[PDB]
PDB file of C-alpha atoms in Angstrom:
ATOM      1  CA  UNK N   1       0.000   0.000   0.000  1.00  0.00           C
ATOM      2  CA  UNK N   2       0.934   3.690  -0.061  1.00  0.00           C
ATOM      3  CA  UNK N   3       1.804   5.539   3.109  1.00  0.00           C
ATOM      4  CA  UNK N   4      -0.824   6.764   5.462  1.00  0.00           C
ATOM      5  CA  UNK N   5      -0.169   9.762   7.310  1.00  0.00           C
ATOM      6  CA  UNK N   6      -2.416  10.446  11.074  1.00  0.00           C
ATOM      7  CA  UNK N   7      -4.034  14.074  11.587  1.00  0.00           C
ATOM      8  CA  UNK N   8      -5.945  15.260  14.159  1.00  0.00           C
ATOM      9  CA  UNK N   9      -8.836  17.347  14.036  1.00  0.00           C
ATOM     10  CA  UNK N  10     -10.037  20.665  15.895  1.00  0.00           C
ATOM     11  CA  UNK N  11     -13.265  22.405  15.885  1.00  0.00           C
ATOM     12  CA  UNK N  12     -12.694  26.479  15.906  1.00  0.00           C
ATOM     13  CA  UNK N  13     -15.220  29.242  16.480  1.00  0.00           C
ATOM     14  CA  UNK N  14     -22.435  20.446  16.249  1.00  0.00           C
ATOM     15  CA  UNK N  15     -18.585  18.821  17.095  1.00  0.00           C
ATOM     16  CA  UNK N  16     -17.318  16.081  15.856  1.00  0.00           C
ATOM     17  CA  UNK N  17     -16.906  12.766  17.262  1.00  0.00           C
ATOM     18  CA  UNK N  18     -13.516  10.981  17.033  1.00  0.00           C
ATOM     19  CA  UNK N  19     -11.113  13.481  15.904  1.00  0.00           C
ATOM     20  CA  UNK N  20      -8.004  11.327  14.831  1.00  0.00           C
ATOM     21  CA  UNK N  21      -7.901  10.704  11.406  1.00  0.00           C
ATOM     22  CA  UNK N  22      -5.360   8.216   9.569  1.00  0.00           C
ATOM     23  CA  UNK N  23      -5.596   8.571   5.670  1.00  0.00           C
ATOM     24  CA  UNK N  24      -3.787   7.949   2.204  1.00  0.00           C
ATOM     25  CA  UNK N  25      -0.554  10.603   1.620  1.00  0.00           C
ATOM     26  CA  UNK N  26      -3.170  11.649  -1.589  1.00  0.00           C
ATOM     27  CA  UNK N  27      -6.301  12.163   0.119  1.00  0.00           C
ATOM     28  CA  UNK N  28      -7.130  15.473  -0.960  1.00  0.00           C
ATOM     29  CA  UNK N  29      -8.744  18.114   0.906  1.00  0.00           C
ATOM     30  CA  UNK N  30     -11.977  17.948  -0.498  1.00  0.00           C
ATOM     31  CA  UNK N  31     -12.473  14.405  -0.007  1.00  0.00           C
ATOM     32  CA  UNK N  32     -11.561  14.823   4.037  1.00  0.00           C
ATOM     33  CA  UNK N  33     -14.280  17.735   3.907  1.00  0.00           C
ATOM     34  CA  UNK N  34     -17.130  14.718   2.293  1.00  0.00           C
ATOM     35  CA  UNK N  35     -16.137  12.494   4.650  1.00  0.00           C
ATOM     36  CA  UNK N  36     -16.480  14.818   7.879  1.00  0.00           C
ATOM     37  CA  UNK N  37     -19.621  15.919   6.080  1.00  0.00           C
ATOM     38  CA  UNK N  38     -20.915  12.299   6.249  1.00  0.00           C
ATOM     39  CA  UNK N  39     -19.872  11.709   9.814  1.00  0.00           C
ATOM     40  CA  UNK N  40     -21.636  14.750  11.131  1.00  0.00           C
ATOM     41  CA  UNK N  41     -24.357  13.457   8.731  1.00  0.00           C
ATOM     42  CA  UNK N  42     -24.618  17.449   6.933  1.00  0.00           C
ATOM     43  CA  UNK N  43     -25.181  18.171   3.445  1.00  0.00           C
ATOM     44  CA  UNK N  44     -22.288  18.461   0.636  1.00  0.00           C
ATOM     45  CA  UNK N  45     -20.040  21.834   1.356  1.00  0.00           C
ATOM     46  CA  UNK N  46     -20.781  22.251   4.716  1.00  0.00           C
ATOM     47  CA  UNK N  47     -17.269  21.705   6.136  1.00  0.00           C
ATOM     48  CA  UNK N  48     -14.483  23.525   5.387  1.00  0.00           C
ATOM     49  CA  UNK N  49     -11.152  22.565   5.980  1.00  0.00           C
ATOM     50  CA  UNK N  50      -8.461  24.934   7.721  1.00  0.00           C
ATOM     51  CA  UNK N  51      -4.796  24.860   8.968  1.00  0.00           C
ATOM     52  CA  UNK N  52      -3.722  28.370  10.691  1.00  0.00           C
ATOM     53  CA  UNK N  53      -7.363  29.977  10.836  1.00  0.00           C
ATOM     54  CA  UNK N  54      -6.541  30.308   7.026  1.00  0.00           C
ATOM     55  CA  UNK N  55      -9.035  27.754   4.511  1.00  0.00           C
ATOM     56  CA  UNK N  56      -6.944  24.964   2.771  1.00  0.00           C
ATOM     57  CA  UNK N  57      -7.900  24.466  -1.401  1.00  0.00           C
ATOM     58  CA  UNK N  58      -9.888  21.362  -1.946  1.00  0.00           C
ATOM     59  CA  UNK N  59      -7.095  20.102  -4.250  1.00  0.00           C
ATOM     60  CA  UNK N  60      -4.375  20.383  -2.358  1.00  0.00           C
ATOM     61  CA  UNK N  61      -3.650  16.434  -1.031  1.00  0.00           C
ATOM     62  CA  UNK N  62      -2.699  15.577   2.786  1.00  0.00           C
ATOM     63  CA  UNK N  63       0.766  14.888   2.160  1.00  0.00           C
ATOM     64  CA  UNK N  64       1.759  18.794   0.852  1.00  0.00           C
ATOM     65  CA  UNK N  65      -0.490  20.056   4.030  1.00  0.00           C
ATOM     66  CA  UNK N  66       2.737  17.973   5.880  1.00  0.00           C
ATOM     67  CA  UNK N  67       5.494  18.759   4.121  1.00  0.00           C
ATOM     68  CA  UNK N  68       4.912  22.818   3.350  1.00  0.00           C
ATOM     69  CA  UNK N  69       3.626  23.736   7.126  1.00  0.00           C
ATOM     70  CA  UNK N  70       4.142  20.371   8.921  1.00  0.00           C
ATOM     71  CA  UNK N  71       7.500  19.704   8.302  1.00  0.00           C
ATOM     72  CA  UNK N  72       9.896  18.735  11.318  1.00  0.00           C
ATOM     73  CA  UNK N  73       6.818  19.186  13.709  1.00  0.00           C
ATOM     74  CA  UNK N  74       5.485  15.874  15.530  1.00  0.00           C
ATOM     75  CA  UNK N  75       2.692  13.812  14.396  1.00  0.00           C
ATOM     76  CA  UNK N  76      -0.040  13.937  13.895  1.00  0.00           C
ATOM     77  CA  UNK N  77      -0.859  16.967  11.633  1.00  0.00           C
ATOM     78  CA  UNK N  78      -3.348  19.468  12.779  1.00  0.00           C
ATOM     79  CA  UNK N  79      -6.028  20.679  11.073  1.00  0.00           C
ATOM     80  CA  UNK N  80      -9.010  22.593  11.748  1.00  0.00           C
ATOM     81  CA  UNK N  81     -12.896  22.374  10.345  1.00  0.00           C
ATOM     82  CA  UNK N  82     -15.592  24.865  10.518  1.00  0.00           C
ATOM     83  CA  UNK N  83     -19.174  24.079  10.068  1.00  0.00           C
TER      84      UNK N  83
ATOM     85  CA  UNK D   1     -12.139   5.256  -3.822  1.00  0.00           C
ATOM     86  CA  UNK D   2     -10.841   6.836  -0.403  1.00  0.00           C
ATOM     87  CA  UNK D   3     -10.140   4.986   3.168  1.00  0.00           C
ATOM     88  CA  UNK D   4     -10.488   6.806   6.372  1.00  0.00           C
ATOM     89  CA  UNK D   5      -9.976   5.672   9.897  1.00  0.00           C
ATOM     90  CA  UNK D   6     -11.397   7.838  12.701  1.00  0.00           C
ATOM     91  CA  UNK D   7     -11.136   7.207  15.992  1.00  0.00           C
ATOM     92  CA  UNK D   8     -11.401   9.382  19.373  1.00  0.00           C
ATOM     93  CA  UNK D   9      -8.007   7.775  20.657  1.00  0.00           C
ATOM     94  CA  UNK D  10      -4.612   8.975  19.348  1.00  0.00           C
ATOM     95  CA  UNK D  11      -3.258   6.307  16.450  1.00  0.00           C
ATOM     96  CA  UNK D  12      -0.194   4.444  16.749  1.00  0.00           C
ATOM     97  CA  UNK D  13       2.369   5.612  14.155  1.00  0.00           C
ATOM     98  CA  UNK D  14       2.040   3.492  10.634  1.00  0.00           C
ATOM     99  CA  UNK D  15       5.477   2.375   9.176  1.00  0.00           C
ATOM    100  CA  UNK D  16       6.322   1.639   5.268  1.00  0.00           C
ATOM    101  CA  UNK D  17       8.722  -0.858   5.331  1.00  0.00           C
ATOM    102  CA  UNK D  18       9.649  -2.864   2.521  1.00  0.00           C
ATOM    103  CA  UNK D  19      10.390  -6.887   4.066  1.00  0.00           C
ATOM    104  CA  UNK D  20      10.485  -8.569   0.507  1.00  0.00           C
ATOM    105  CA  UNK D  21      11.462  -7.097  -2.774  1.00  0.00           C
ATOM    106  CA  UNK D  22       8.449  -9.741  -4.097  1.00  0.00           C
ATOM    107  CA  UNK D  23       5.736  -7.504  -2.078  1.00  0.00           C
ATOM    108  CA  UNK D  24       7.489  -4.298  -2.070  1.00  0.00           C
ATOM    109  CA  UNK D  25       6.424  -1.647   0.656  1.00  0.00           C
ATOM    110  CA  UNK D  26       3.720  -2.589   2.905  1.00  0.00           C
ATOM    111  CA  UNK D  27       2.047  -0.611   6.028  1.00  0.00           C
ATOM    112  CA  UNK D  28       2.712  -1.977   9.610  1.00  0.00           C
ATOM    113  CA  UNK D  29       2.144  -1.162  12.849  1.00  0.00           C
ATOM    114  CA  UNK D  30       5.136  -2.184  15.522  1.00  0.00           C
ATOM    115  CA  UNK D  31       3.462  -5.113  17.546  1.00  0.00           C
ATOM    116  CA  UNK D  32       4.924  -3.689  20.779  1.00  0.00           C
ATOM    117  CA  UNK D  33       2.730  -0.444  20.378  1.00  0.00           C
ATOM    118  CA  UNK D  34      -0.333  -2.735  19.413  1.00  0.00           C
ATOM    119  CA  UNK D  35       0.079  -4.687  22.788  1.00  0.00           C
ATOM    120  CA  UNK D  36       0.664  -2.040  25.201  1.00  0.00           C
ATOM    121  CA  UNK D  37      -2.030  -0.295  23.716  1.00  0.00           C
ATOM    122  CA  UNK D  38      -4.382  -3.381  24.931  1.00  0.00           C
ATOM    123  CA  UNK D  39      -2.048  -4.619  27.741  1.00  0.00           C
ATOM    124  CA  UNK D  40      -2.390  -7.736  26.174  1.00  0.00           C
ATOM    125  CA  UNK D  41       0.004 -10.547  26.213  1.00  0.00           C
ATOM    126  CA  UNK D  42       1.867 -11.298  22.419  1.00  0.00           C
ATOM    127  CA  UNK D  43       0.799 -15.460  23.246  1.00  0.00           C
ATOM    128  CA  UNK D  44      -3.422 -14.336  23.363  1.00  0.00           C
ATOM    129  CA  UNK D  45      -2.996 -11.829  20.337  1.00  0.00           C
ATOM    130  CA  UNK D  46      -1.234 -14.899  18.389  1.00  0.00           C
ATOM    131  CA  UNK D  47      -4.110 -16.838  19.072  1.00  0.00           C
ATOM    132  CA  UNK D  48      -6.658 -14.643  18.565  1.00  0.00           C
ATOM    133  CA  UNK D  49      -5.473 -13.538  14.849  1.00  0.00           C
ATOM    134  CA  UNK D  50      -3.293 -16.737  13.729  1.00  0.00           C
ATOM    135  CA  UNK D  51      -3.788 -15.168   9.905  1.00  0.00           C
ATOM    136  CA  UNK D  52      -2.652 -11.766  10.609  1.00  0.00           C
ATOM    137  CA  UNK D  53       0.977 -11.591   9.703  1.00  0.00           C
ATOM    138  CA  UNK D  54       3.691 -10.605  11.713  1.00  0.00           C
ATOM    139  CA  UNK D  55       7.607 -10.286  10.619  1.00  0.00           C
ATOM    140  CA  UNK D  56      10.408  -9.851  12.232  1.00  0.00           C
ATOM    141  CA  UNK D  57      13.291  -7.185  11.072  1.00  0.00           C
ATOM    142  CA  UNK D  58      16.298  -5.709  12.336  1.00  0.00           C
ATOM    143  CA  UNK D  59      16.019  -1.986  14.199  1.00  0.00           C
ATOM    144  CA  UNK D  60      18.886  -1.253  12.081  1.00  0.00           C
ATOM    145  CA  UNK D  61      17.407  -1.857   9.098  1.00  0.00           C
ATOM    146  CA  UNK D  62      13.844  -0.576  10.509  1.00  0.00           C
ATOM    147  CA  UNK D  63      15.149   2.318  11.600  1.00  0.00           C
ATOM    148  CA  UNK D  64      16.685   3.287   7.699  1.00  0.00           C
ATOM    149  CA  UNK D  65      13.350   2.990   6.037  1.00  0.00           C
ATOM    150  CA  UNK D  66      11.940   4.905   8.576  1.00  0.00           C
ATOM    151  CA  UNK D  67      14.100   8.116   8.137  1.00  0.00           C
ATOM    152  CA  UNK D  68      14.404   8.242   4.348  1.00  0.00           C
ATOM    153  CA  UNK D  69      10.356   8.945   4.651  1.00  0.00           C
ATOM    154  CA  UNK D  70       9.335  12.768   4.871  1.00  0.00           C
ATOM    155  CA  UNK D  71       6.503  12.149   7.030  1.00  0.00           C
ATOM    156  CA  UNK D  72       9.102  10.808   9.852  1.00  0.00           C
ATOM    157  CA  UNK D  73      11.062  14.080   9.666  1.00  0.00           C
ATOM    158  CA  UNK D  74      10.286  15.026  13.485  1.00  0.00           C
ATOM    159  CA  UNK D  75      13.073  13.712  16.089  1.00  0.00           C
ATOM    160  CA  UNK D  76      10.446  13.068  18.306  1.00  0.00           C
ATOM    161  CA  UNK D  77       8.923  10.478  15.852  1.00  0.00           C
ATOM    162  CA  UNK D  78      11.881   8.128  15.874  1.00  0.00           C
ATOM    163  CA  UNK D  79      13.485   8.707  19.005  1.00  0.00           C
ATOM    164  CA  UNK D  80      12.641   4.842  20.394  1.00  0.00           C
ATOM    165  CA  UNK D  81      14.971   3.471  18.115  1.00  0.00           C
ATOM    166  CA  UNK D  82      18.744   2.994  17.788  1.00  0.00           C
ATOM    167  CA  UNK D  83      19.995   3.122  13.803  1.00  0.00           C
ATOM    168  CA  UNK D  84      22.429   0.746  14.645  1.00  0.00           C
ATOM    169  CA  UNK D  85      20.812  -1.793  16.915  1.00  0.00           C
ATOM    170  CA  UNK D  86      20.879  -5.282  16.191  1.00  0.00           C
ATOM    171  CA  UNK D  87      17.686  -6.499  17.792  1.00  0.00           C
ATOM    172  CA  UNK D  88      15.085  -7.761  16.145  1.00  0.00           C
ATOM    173  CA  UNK D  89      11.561  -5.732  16.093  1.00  0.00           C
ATOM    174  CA  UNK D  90       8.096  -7.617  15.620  1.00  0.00           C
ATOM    175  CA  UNK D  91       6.210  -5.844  13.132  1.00  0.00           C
ATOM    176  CA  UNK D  92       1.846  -6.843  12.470  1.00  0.00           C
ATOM    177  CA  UNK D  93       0.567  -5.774   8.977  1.00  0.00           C
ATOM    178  CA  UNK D  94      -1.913  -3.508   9.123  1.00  0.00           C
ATOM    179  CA  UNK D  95      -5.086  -4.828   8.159  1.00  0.00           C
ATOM    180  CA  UNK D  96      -8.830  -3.584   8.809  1.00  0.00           C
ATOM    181  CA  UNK D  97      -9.181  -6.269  11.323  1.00  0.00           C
ATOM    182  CA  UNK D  98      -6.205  -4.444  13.214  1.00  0.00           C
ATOM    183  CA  UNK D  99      -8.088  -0.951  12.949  1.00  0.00           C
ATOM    184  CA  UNK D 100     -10.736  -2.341  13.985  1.00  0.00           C
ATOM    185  CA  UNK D 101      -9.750  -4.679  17.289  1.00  0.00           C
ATOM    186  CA  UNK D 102      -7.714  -1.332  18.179  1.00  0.00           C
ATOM    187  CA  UNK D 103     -11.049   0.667  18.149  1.00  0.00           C
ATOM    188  CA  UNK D 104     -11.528   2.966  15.308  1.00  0.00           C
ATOM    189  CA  UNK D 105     -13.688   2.804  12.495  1.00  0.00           C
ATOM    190  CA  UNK D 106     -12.665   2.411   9.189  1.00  0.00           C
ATOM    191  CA  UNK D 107     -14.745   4.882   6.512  1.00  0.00           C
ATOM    192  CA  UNK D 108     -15.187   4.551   2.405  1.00  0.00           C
ATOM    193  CA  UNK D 109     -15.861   7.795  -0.004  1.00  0.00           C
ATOM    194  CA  UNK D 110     -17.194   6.839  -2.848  1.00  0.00           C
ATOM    195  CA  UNK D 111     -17.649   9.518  -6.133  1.00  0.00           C
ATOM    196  CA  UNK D 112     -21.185   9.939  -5.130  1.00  0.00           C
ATOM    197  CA  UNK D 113     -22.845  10.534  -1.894  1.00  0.00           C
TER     198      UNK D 113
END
């Protein structure tokens, strides 16, 4: 298989559930934001994704969320989701 | 199609470690970290899954696949292992089943929804 990579989620100013996420180095940031949307059990685009109060593209995959602001830091990667 | 594992308990660090050229890379979790984990003993986890495979590789060698990866680019993230140790680690593939008995839940996204 391809490497999986762990992240951990944080709700900023309906919460989640179990925040740890483990997922393929390509998941991409709009397939994290349908699957969050299925687990709060919300219609499509109702979750966005953030890292730094700042909203992440819904192309950009997990693995260059890592490597261009995660780099050197401990895992898991944090992320943040608004609703 | 995507696979996500959530869980409300931190997840034990996955490792891409290559134990046959045949197979190439495959994901693993260290066994150690799965036992603690349930404080259970390695004899009753043998038992329990006597199809789940476990291997056994040198820290040295563990411990070089490791740090070529990006993703293990913290200190903190391989700082249980000596590069040039010549025990032997137990490593468990990491299957569903694994996910699963460790208490997570394992996800699909599919195209549609």
């Amino acid at each position: 298989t391809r490497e999986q990579l762990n992240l951990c989620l944080e709700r900023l100013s309906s919460v989640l559930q179990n925040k740890y996420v483990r997922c393929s180095v390509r998941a991409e940031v709009r397939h994290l934001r349908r699957v969050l949307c299925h687990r709060l059990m919300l219609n499509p685009q109702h979750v966005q994704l953030l890292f730094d109060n700042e909203v992440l593209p819904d192309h950009m995959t997990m693995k260059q969320i890592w490597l261009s602001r995660w780099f050197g830091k401990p895992s898991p990667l944090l992320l943040q989701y608004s609703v | 199609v995507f696979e996500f594992e959530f869980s409300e308990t931190p997840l034990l660090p996955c490792y891409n470690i290559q134990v046959s050229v045949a197979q190439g890379p495959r994901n693993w979790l260290l066994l150690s970290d799965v036992l603690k984990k349930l404080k259970m003993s390695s004899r009753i986890f043998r038992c329990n899954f006597p199809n789940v495979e476990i291997v056994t590789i040198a820290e040295a060698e563990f411990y070089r696949q490791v740090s070529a990866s990006l993703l293990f680019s913290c200190s903190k993230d391989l700082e249980a292992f000596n590069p040039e140790s010549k025990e032997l680690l137990d490593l468990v593939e990491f299957t569903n089943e694994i996910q699963t008995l460790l208490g997570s839940s394992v996800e699909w996204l599919h195209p549609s929804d």
